[PDB]
């Protein structure tokens, strides 16, 4: 299952669909509709379409209706009649969407064409979000996308993470179980494979390819710091050099300057960094300072 988990097929991709709708059946937790004119305007549009023309000059003050935006993913090779999941998010001053029902909503693409029609019952968790829900199989595909799959004798596998070693390894793995010249790497992120002419032939070839297992090679040393959530993650290839670290309210347990032992593997790094007795908030600053000095032999990314 390595090749499918590492790469993606060229032309097999997911698009994004968006639309506007109304959610009805709320228990008095909808829009105020005095500060969100589009809710009442679109309700009047729906009624006018259905055969009820409400007078232009009138005051409608609803409480069970909310104006929402619906987002979905158009899956690869989607055919009309299939169903997809949608996400429903409130748009103006609505308290909750607990037990609402999404009315008929056309999901447009980037090209402003309807690719799906959405309508269903929203499932809201019930510290849980109240203005956001999900409808499983809530939208039906109405339009299909032409594709070039099955045409030509080349298929590109696109690596999720760029690596010359991994690209070469996938090339050598495809060229071991599937013939001599069945794959050629084009760059650090693309492996071009030669496929038989046809549609089912390429499907069979890619089915074979996808479940093959490749031995993942060492992949860069990096320390990911998320300051907004206060988390630090170090992969296996992170090392350290011997150097001294000082920080506020931290001391040898006896001065404030603690020596960090050079470290070869990740267990040594973890032990050396835990010897400092540093909170992760302090550990982030320690890692940044060590990266500046040169003790930390890894790529420090702040996400």
């Amino acid at each position: 299952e390595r090749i499918r988990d590492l790469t993606s097929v060229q032309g097999v991709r997911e698009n994004s669909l968006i639309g506007y709708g109304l959610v009805v059946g709320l228990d008095g937790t909808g829009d105020q509709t005095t500060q969100t004119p589009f809710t009442t305007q679109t309700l009047n549009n729906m009624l006018s379409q259905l055969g009820i023309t409400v007078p232009t000059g009138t005051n409608m003050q609803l409480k069970n209706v909310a104006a929402v935006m619906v987002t979905a993913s158009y899956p690869p090779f989607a055919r009309q009649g299939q169903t997809i999941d949608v996400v429903v998010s409130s748009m103006g001053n609505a308290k909750s969407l607990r037990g609402g029902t999404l009315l008929m909503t056309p999901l447009k693409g980037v090209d402003s064409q309807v690719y799906a029609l959405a309508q269903g019952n929203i499932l809201v968790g019930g510290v849980n979000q109240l203005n956001g829900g999900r409808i499983t199989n809530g939208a039906i595909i109405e339009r299909e996308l032409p594709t070039q799959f099955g045409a030509g004798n080349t298929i590109n596998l696109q690596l999720n993470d760029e690596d010359f070693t991994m690209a070469q390894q996938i090339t050598d793995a495809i060229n071991r179980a599937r013939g001599y010249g069945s794959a050629t790497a084009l760059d650090a992120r693309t492996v071009q494979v030669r496929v038989p002419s046809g549609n089912s032939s390429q499907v069979r070839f890619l089915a074979d390819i996808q479940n093959m297992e490749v031995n993942v090679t060492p992949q860069d040393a990096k320390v990911v710091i998320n300051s907004r959530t206060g988390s630090v993650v170090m992969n296996r290839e992170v090392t350290l050099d011997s150097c001294a670290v000082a920080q506020g309210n931290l001391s040898v347990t006896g001065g404030s300057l603690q020596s960090v032992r050079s470290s070869a593997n990740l267990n040594s790094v973890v032990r050396a960094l835990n010897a400092l007795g540093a909170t992760p908030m302090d550990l982030m600053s320690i890692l940044q300072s060590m990266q500046s000095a040169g003790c930390l032999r890894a790529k420090l990314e702040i996400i």
Partner: protein, 104 residues
């Protein structure tokens, strides 16, 4: 009105204020069901005989309403438990709080 615990209390003090997110609340800040949101464009707020809350705005000859102020009626008003902070709760006596629009 709605207590912070989530249970409903009943008051007769008629002093209300609009808080920073509309909502007519009591002087202690407790929200006054059935929820009344006042817009910022309001020039004058009128609470009617039957509890209709109408709001006048600029460039709109017709006053924009907001909601109905419903009163709770009990069958033994002597029986409510006085919580303290100008609030009464339904005891075993004065049960079945009957909501009604004022006037009927």
């Amino acid at each position: 009105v709605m207590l912070p615990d989530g249970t409903s209390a009943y008051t007769r003090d008629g002093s209300f204020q609009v808080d920073q997110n509309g909502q007519l609340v009591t002087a202690g800040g407790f929200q006054v069901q059935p929820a009344i949101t006042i817009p910022a464009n309001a020039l004058s707020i009128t609470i009617g005989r039957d509890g209709v809350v109408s709001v006048t705005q600029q460039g709109q000859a017709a006053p924009v309403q907001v909601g109905q102020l419903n009163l709770t009626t009990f069958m033994n008003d002597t029986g409510l438990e006085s919580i303290g902070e100008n609030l009464y709760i339904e005891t075993q006596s004065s049960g079945a709080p009957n909501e009604s629009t004022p006037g009927l």
